[PDB]
Amino acid sequence: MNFYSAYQHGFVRVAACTHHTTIGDPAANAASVLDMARACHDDGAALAVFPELTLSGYSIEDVLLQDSLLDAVEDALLDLVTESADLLPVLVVGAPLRHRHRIYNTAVVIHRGAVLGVVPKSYLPTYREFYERRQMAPGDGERGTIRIGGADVAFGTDLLFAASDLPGFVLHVEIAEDMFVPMPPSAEAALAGATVLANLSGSPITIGRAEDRRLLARSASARCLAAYVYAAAGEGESTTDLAWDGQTMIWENGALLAESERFPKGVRRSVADVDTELLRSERLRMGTFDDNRRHHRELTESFRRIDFALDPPAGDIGLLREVERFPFVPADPQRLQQDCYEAYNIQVSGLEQRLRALDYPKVVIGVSGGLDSTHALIVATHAMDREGRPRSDILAFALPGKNNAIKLARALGVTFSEIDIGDTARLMLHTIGHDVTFENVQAGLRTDYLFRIANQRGGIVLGTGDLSELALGWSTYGVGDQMSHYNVNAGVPKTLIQHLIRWVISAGEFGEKVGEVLQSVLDTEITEAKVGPFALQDFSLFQVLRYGFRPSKIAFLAWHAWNDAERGNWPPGFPKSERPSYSLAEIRHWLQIFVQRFYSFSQFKRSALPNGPKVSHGGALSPRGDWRAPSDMSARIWLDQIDREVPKG
Amino acid sequence: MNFYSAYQHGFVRVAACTHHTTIGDPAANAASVLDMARACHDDGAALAVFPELTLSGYSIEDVLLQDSLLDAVEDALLDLVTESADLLPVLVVGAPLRHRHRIYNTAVVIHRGAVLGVVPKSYLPTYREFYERRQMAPGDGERGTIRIGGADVAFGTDLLFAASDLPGFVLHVEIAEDMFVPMPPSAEAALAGATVLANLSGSPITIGRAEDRRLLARSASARCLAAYVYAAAGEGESTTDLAWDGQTMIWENGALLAESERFPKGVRRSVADVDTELLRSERLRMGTFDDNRRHHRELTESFRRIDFALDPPAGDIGLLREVERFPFVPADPQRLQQD
Amino acid sequence: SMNFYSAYQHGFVRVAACTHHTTIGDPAANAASVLDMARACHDDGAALAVFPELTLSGYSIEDVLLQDSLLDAVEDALLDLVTESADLLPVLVVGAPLRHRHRIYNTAVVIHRGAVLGVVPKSYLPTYREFYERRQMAPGDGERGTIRIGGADVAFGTDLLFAASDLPGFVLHVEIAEDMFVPMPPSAEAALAGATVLANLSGSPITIGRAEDRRLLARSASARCLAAYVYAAAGEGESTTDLAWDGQTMIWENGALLAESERFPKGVRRSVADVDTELLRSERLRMGTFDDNRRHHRELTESFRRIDFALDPPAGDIGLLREVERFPFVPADPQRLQQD
Ligand SMILES: Nc1ncnc2c1ncn2[C@@H]1O[C@H](COP(=O)(O)OP(=O)(O)OC[C@H]2O[C@@H]([n+]3cccc(C(=O)O)c3)[C@H](O)[C@@H]2O)[C@@H](O)[C@H]1O
Ligand SMILES: Nc1ncnc2c1ncn2[C@@H]1O[C@H](COP(=O)(O)O)[C@@H](O)[C@H]1O
């Protein structure tokens, strides 16, 4: 396999194009279409979607009904078809075409010298600035075939274009207004199998219309678990009564992959790599999507599937896609602030319920001065404040076997104390006739003490292990830090914890002293890679937990995100000395370790897990929630996948 | 005519309510529901929507299948119904109810001492943190009636509640996940006539989920030329594995009318005046909306219409709505800069 | 003319229910255990080998079913089996989580002589008590059409019958686990439509009393449907994170037990018996109300698709794997004879 090929990793390269309109002149429009299609070809694109009525111009009104115009459209369309014999991408071009009694506003799907199909718009707006029913017939409910340059090709609203060599790429095409009705053609097509939804739009621009386009194309892509590819008309449409902004965009399951300049001068393309496996993975898991199809089975079974062989380029053509380094930590500051606010309120409100339900016990917690336990102590305080409970009901414990610990505790005003576990550990090690056991005897005694104090003092022990530690099994099982009465960090990955502390500092409601101590914790602690860098492990974890991607796909994505520290954006709080870049060899190394630990070694530790709230849309690792898996399984197949598919460096 | 009455100008006052959950304790949830409904009444609201499985709590898992729990839900539901005899608004309350072989995740629509109908959730998520098909049966495709405290009332995914004195107020009710599938019950109901779409949600909060809720309730309300009234569960749900933010919101044709504080302490309501005439005017003009109905005629004609008489307050009750001085000039600077 | 000592020439069909060694999360290993047992079934001249539910992945792996590498490994392993089957006599019925359309299905792949004859999805997916199947997998009830497996379109759905063109008494229908437990099981419509041999691939974690439940339903099925019922459960290797497994296999014929293997074995086990297709044929010939029931459910029963294959069984003496009592009227079992 070619590890550097995006097509081999389930990517399909898609283009939404806005061309130069010459109204009433089809050979000129076709010439602009052919030039852009040659570009999309050179880019290795599999699909190029153009605007509504591309070949005539959308805005020409009664001129659509003129024989010379209709004639010119056909001649021009047939030239394109002939040119397409040497073009890689499927071309979706607009054209007013005669069929039966009337003209239809259609999209012609073209590929390698043939017309695969012809799709008519279903809903024809005839209100406000729109007059479509005057010239054109509604396509909804039309089936059968249409004759185009001596051939009978599929015609109708029921068409799917499936790539026979790219099973994840199934195209449905709709037109403009089609996407705006309560029950759009594209939603039935997704149910029926379409993974990529194209929209050819005219869409005269008005104040606020761009926002409407986005709301509907975006919600469509999220509801239908699909890529949505959208192209509007720009320069060259008539301005007798309307203006045009040439907007193009590409959405994937709710996220913007690419958009182009509004009101540009000259032609514009959006070009993105759509991840078909991502779409595949979400449909695999969201069972109610398939339930919805089954409930509309007669609607969804009637589609006709037109097959074509794409034969994409096999080599390295890069990756036109933003792969963030931190799936759990958005590089956008407004976004990361939102996530922090939510993470923190999740942790707190979760603990508050546990406390209310237990009639407000004391809170017992081991504070080591580390990131985790610090953040947990902050969470616990805010919870007790919100519930109108004295901060002295928090029992924080230093359990040496740092100063930041006692300082924070003193600053917050919780009840602080120290218990030296060393003698108890000595006694235990001697009694046992005594490395893992030595480490573990201490970690165990910590938990054992806290538990007994909780019994003694009417409290509950607060766990502090984080999501990355759960994932990797980096904890001490049962009698050890893995165990507690309620774990507030169980759902937060290590990569996020530091930003939550930053957020608490920046908000500043604990006051300046607490602020300074927390800041000190930060400065001290960012200065256990037998399990590798947490940045890479949190990366793999997201891919595995959310999408179940194979290891070679995970390596490809990580390498694209991490291999060059100059490219892509870093979240806030990463000074340049801490902007590592990783080689393929390194990614490959830590990934072998990740699959071994994640799929084989660690599950038993997750299997007997204390209560705590899920936090990230990435998922959590509760065996009662997002991750059900055997405690007694080998990881051989994952390890073998890496062996065979990921290059050594 | 009373010129100062919102109801006489085609407004309908609507409330999305997040109550205090006491898991496993129906009479306590009912008491929280009754208190908020009495508030919604005092405000002259016509509609009060509560969160998914209001009466039992959404988060209780196999406890849903315990007879004493199911029994307590019924008793509590029937007490509410009796109390509603003196309440103005239509109450939409969640309840696990037994019907035929199983329990359904349902919304009970209650009005002035009667149950107008019972709507079961259609799509039951059984993935990630959701386990709903384990305890509860899918309601998609169910019609007929259900027996509730000695009476046969309409049961199913095909119901429309039409105010006989307020023609612009036609209610459809769906539940949580129903709004997230490619072809939601509420989209067919809008084509068939519903102007106000209610959603009872549980919706454990996760990073980014609040944005997903908004994207889907908003696009719904825009595509369906309707008001969309949404209530999520908050304080009191179990935190064994999840947390809850109590979010409530009301959308009208793509615009936010009202939302309440996330993660509140105590109960919260969004209350807005919905402009039924604005909805009516947009449907009047967008022909392709009606074309879409005609194309799905067998789907859209099969709805059952349950009529009720609202009898709203006739006097001045103010106007719970932001009316901008300059329809053409947004007061929000980021907005105006865009325009 | 004929070979009087050949069981095949007297209307017998040799059938095998196999419980293989599960290696959870490891399709190539399960496939190797499957191939070894199938080679044995071949040597025994068997016409049919039924394996346990989700054979190729392991039944108990939960959300691991949703992992691309696992789904990918299953496909590869399945296609290898198919290639090996070119030299195997028996039709192989193997379990596999397969992707189709939006989801994965819990399916049985029917394989014969180098081709996939058909792919059958479980219809009813238990999601209660210790079972969580709807979370990972889609219900197969009401699915028809085809599925693409290693470059070919093969029949897919709950409406399939596999008919031996040279052994008219041998018509196979396949269902899965829970399918046999609902008031109106796939296999009862399939019997009405023609099926003489009903296969069941089972996972079936063992609980106190469950083996008695399995028997009561497989046995009453075989009696009500006038058919052979061939049943295989999962054994050693399934995860014991929450469940245990007994590996039970059994073969029933019109209400009678022809063979069962050792519960909780160490190592792989097979039930192998000679099914008497003429006996089944003779009972159906005479019980008119069986055919009246089919006529009353004609639209249900006429819709099955019939996939034909040529078995070409061994012609020689291969013994007779069947208890033939000396005294049809006098049971050898004392408790039974006392009753009589
Ligand atoms: N599948 C399975 N089912 C049931 N039991 C299984 C098992 N696999 C191992 N075991 C047993 O479980 C035990 C091994 O697990 P465990 O006892 O947890 O210990 P183990 O994972 O071997 O070691 C703990 C490691 O975690 C590190 N650690 C400890 C504490 C805190 C942190 C931190 O960074 O916060 C890190 C520490 O450096 C050490 O390397 C053994 O008794 C083993 O026999
Ligand atoms: N030296 C220490 N003093 C107080 N608590 C500690 C100490 N070491 C570990 N702990 C507690 O045990 C947790 C995990 O232990 P570990 O990661 O093994 O050092 C910490 O987050 C604290 O809650």
Short mmCIF file of N, CA, C and O in Angstrom, two decimals, chain A residues 188-221:
data_model
loop_
_atom_site.label_atom_id
_atom_site.label_comp_id
_atom_site.label_asym_id
_atom_site.label_seq_id
_atom_site.Cartn_x
_atom_site.Cartn_y
_atom_site.Cartn_z
N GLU A 188 -33.85 11.93 1.89
CA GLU A 188 -34.23 10.53 1.51
C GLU A 188 -33.05 9.84 0.84
O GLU A 188 -32.80 8.68 1.12
N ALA A 189 -32.27 10.55 0.04
CA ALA A 189 -31.11 9.90 -0.59
C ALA A 189 -30.04 9.44 0.41
O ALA A 189 -29.31 8.49 0.14
N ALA A 190 -29.87 10.19 1.51
CA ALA A 190 -28.84 9.82 2.50
C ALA A 190 -29.27 8.50 3.12
O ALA A 190 -28.51 7.56 3.08
N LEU A 191 -30.50 8.47 3.64
CA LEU A 191 -31.14 7.24 4.11
C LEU A 191 -30.94 6.12 3.13
O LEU A 191 -30.80 5.00 3.53
N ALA A 192 -30.92 6.41 1.84
CA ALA A 192 -30.86 5.33 0.87
C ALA A 192 -29.45 4.93 0.58
O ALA A 192 -29.20 3.95 -0.13
N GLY A 193 -28.51 5.68 1.11
CA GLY A 193 -27.13 5.36 0.82
C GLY A 193 -26.18 6.47 0.41
O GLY A 193 -24.99 6.22 0.28
N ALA A 194 -26.67 7.67 0.15
CA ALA A 194 -25.77 8.64 -0.45
C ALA A 194 -24.93 9.17 0.66
O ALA A 194 -25.48 9.48 1.72
N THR A 195 -23.63 9.25 0.42
CA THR A 195 -22.69 9.79 1.38
C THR A 195 -22.24 11.25 1.07
O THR A 195 -21.86 12.04 1.96
N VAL A 196 -22.26 11.59 -0.21
CA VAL A 196 -21.91 12.92 -0.67
C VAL A 196 -23.12 13.56 -1.35
O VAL A 196 -23.65 13.02 -2.34
N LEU A 197 -23.59 14.66 -0.80
CA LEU A 197 -24.75 15.36 -1.35
C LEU A 197 -24.32 16.62 -2.06
O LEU A 197 -23.79 17.53 -1.42
N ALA A 198 -24.50 16.69 -3.36
CA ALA A 198 -24.23 17.91 -4.12
C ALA A 198 -25.46 18.82 -4.32
O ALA A 198 -26.61 18.35 -4.49
N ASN A 199 -25.21 20.12 -4.30
CA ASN A 199 -26.23 21.12 -4.55
C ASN A 199 -25.72 22.17 -5.58
O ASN A 199 -24.72 22.87 -5.34
N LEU A 200 -26.36 22.24 -6.74
CA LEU A 200 -26.10 23.34 -7.70
C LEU A 200 -27.07 24.45 -7.39
O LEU A 200 -28.29 24.21 -7.35
N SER A 201 -26.54 25.64 -7.09
CA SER A 201 -27.37 26.79 -6.70
C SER A 201 -27.21 28.02 -7.63
O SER A 201 -26.12 28.24 -8.16
N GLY A 202 -28.30 28.78 -7.84
CA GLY A 202 -28.25 30.11 -8.49
C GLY A 202 -28.05 31.12 -7.35
O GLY A 202 -26.93 31.63 -7.08
N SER A 203 -29.16 31.32 -6.63
CA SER A 203 -29.12 31.90 -5.29
C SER A 203 -28.66 33.34 -5.38
O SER A 203 -27.53 33.68 -5.01
N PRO A 204 -29.53 34.20 -5.90
CA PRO A 204 -29.18 35.63 -5.87
C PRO A 204 -28.91 36.02 -4.44
O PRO A 204 -29.66 35.56 -3.56
N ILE A 205 -27.88 36.85 -4.20
CA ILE A 205 -27.47 37.17 -2.84
C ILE A 205 -28.33 38.30 -2.33
O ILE A 205 -28.57 39.26 -3.03
N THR A 206 -28.77 38.18 -1.09
CA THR A 206 -29.51 39.22 -0.41
C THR A 206 -28.89 39.38 0.97
O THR A 206 -28.17 38.47 1.44
N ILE A 207 -29.17 40.47 1.67
CA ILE A 207 -28.67 40.59 3.04
C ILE A 207 -29.18 39.38 3.80
O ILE A 207 -30.40 39.10 3.75
N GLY A 208 -28.26 38.67 4.47
CA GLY A 208 -28.64 37.59 5.36
C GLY A 208 -28.81 36.21 4.68
O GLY A 208 -28.98 35.22 5.35
N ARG A 209 -28.69 36.15 3.37
CA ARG A 209 -28.94 34.90 2.68
C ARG A 209 -27.79 33.94 2.84
O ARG A 209 -28.01 32.74 2.83
N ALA A 210 -26.57 34.47 2.93
CA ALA A 210 -25.40 33.61 3.07
C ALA A 210 -25.51 32.80 4.37
O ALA A 210 -25.13 31.64 4.43
N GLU A 211 -26.10 33.42 5.39
CA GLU A 211 -26.28 32.78 6.70
C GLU A 211 -27.32 31.71 6.55
O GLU A 211 -27.26 30.66 7.19
N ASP A 212 -28.29 31.95 5.69
CA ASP A 212 -29.33 30.94 5.51
C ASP A 212 -28.79 29.73 4.77
O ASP A 212 -29.09 28.60 5.13
N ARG A 213 -27.95 29.97 3.79
CA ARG A 213 -27.33 28.89 3.05
C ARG A 213 -26.54 28.00 3.98
O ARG A 213 -26.62 26.75 3.93
N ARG A 214 -25.76 28.64 4.82
CA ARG A 214 -24.90 27.94 5.72
C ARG A 214 -25.70 27.14 6.73
O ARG A 214 -25.32 26.04 7.06
N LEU A 215 -26.78 27.71 7.25
CA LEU A 215 -27.53 27.04 8.29
C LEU A 215 -28.10 25.74 7.72
O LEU A 215 -28.03 24.69 8.35
N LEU A 216 -28.64 25.82 6.51
CA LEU A 216 -29.28 24.69 5.86
C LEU A 216 -28.25 23.73 5.29
O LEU A 216 -28.40 22.54 5.52
N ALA A 217 -27.18 24.20 4.63
CA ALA A 217 -26.22 23.20 4.14
C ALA A 217 -25.50 22.47 5.34
O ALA A 217 -25.15 21.29 5.28
N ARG A 218 -25.31 23.20 6.42
CA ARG A 218 -24.62 22.64 7.53
C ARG A 218 -25.49 21.65 8.29
O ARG A 218 -25.05 20.53 8.59
N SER A 219 -26.71 22.06 8.62
CA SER A 219 -27.61 21.14 9.29
C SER A 219 -27.91 19.90 8.42
O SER A 219 -27.99 18.81 8.94
N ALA A 220 -28.00 20.07 7.12
CA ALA A 220 -28.18 18.94 6.22
C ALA A 220 -27.01 17.98 6.39
O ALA A 220 -27.23 16.76 6.36
N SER A 221 -25.79 18.50 6.51
CA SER A 221 -24.64 17.60 6.49
C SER A 221 -24.56 16.87 7.83
O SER A 221 -24.18 15.71 7.85
#
